[PDB]
């Protein structure tokens, strides 16, 4: 059951994908609002996917070794120049994480977009599936495609100070490494903003 | 039923799985408005107290059920015991504004007072946790989060109740821990 995504001009086509899961909505709410006086100019140039290395999966890691990633992370291309040149913006996130095994090692990796992150105290983790998630395990699907719309206490925010979403990747089952299966499996993320709007051109150096 | 599962599709199966006729459900006592309409106690209290939400005890009903959702929105029914004049102002108010008193104030009724103070915070909807640095590195909620600031000459108790509340984006609830047994085994009425 293959699945071909597409954003901007780059594409990630993963055969192992089981299905996209939307978070909290199928689509964002209205963009125009009293704040900014409808000065927003939808910039679709940043819809690119960008890789990002994540905590390496090792037979060692027990249940609950959370590896978080704050969003938007340092991005050094179009999106970075944008968030440094514009004051306010907003985006849906459309994350995509892929852990490629040899299909001979068992382990259930749980990837969930949790908004407004705050350190869990190892009792909360059991309840980490409350938000948008997909179980990425070598036995069935090597990828998880989650797309969440931007949501925050305001219509727009300064990404320099307020970072709503954090892609957390909890290790539900320790990766059992068989002789045939890969002992260590790395985790890479295709994170790609969607419906990115901006506002208020900001004077740069 | 053997669903795909690892796609995390919300699959559920009743009793009809093995010749079981399912019975009706009434799910009113768990409505998020009826579970938030009830009062709650805020502790501690002192003169010049920000009536800012999530200052309630964690394990209380309204407390936990509100910390069960990242984003909430609600109109407050405030109930204060007080001893003098009680003045109340919205989130965007300079500390000095409380004194003058034409901005709403309730004189000392013989029992405690009761007041409706609406949702005044300028943000679209409030939050229980704010990730990111303070405005100009701690999860320290911004001052615009609190609904209002009350000052009376002295406050004995304070109760709060959220009306017409709707909660967004649920969060973990973190039930009590029990060990060295299999049921919590609390004394029952």
């Amino acid at each position, epitope marked *: 059951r293959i699945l071909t995504t597409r954003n901007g001009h780059t594409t990630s086509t993963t055969q192992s994908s089981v299905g996209v899961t939307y978070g909290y909505s199928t689509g964002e709410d209205h963009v125009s609002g009293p704040n900014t006086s409808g000065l927003e100019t939808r910039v679709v140039q940043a819809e690119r996917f960008f890789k990002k290395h994540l*905590f390496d999966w*090792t*037979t*060692d890691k*027990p249940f609950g070794h959370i*590896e978080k990633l704050e969003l938007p992370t340092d991005h050094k291309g179009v999106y970075g120049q944008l968030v440094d040149s514009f004051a306010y913006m907003r985006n849906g996130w459309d994350v995509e994480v892929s852990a490629v095994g040899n299909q001979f090692n068992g382990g259930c990796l749980l990837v969930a977009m949790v908004p407004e992150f705050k350190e869990f105290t*190892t*009792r909360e983790k059991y309840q980490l599936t409350l938000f948008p998630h997909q179980f990425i395990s070598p036995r069935t699907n090597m990828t998880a495609h989650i797309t969440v719309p931007y949501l925050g206490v305001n219509r727009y925010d300064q990404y320099n100070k307020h970072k709503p979403w954090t892609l957390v990747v909890m290790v539900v089952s320790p990766l059992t490494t068989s002789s045939i299966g890969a002992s260590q499996i790395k985790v890479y993320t295709n994170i790609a903003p969607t419906h990115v709007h901006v506002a208020g051109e900001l004077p740069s150096k | 039923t053997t669903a795909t599962g690892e796609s995390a599709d919300p699959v559920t199966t009743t009793v009809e799985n093995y010749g079981g006729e399912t019975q009706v459900q009434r799910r009113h006592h768990t409505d998020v408005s009826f579970i938030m309409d009830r009062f709650v106690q805020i502790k501690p209290v002192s003169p010049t107290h920000v009536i800012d939400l999530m200052q309630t005890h964690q394990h209380g009903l309204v407390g936990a059920m509100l910390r069960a959702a990242t984003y909430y929105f609600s109109d407050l029914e405030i109930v204060v015991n007080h001893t003098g004049r009680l003045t109340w102002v919205p989130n965007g108010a300079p500390e000095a504004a409380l004194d003058n008193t034409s901005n709403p104030t309730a004189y000392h009724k013989a029992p405690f007072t009761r007041l409706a103070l609406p949702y005044t915070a300028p943000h679209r909807v409030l939050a229980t946790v704010y990730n990111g640095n303070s405005k100009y590195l701690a999860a320290q909620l911004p001052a615009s989060f609190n609904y209002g600031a009350i000052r009376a000459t002295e406050i004995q108790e304070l109760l709060v109740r959220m009306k017409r509340a709707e909660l967004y984006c649920p969060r973990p609830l973190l039930a009590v821990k029990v060990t060295s047994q299999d049921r919590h085994k609390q004394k029952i009425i």
Partner: antibody, heavy 97, light 109 residues
Framework: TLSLTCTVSGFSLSDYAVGWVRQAPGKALEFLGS???????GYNPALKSRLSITKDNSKNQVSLSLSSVTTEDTATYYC?????????????????? | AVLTQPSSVSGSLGQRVSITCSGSSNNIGRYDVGWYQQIPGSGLRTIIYASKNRPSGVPDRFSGSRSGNTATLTISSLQAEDEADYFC???????????FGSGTTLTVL
């Protein structure tokens, strides 16, 4: 024997596993033993049958003692709280504090 | 034991200094190592646990890399209090814990 049981400050010993480690004179280290929070214990396969590891779960006190203590067994013993309630293997414990 | 590190390391304040830790596919190739710190006094105040993350309560400079088959500790800037005996520690797949870190006498130079 030799018991150098250090109790935990806060940090409910209910959900956290603990392990002790010996730092030989100078700088030379060996992992002594670790007890999973579920009551399960893990200790070096080389170093066994002399260690008494147990977790009072109620008094926030962890118990270990060494028998046949000899002068060569001597170190600046520590105790450190692991970030995992249980360890998949008996030896991988050292990795997490 | 088998986990070998440069027993001495030269570094100075102003530039980044690293610490290499080398072992094979048994020990490091598929197991997370741990970087601890010790000043001459005492302690295991962990610079890097789980190979990738520093414990909450340490400056962000200490970066920990689990590249190739040997875990490397990278101090982006040193300080005077930076010098101590760092240690590399991890488990071996076909052996015991072997937390063996020879220790890297560090110097501010």
């Amino acid at each position: 024997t030799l018991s150098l049981t250090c109790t935990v400050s806060g940090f409910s010993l209910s959900d956290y596993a603990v392990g002790w480690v010996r730092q030989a004179p100078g700088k030379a280290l060996e992992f002594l033993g670790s007890i999973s929070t579920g009551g399960n214990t893990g200790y070096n396969p080389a170093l066994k049958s002399r260690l008494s590891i147990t977790k009072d779960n109620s008094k926030n006190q962890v118990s270990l003692s060494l028998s046949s203590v000899t002068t060569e067994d001597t170190a600046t013993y520590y105790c450190t709280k692991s970030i995992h309630s249980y360890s998949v293997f008996e030896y991988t414990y050292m990795q997490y504090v | 034991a088998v986990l070998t590190q440069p027993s001495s390391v030269s570094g100075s304040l102003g530039q980044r200094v690293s610490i290499t830790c080398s072992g094979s596919s048994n020990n490091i190739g598929r197991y997370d190592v741990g970087w601890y710190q010790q000043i001459p006094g005492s302690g295991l105040r962990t610079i890097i646990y789980a190979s990738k993350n520093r414990p909450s309560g340490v400056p962000d400079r200490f970066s920990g890399s689990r590249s190739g088959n040997t875990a490397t500790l990278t101090i982006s800037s040193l300080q005077a209090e930076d010098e101590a005996d760092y240690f590399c520690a991890t488990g071996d797949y076909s052996s015991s814990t072997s937390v063996f870190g020879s220790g890297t006498t560090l110097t501010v130079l």
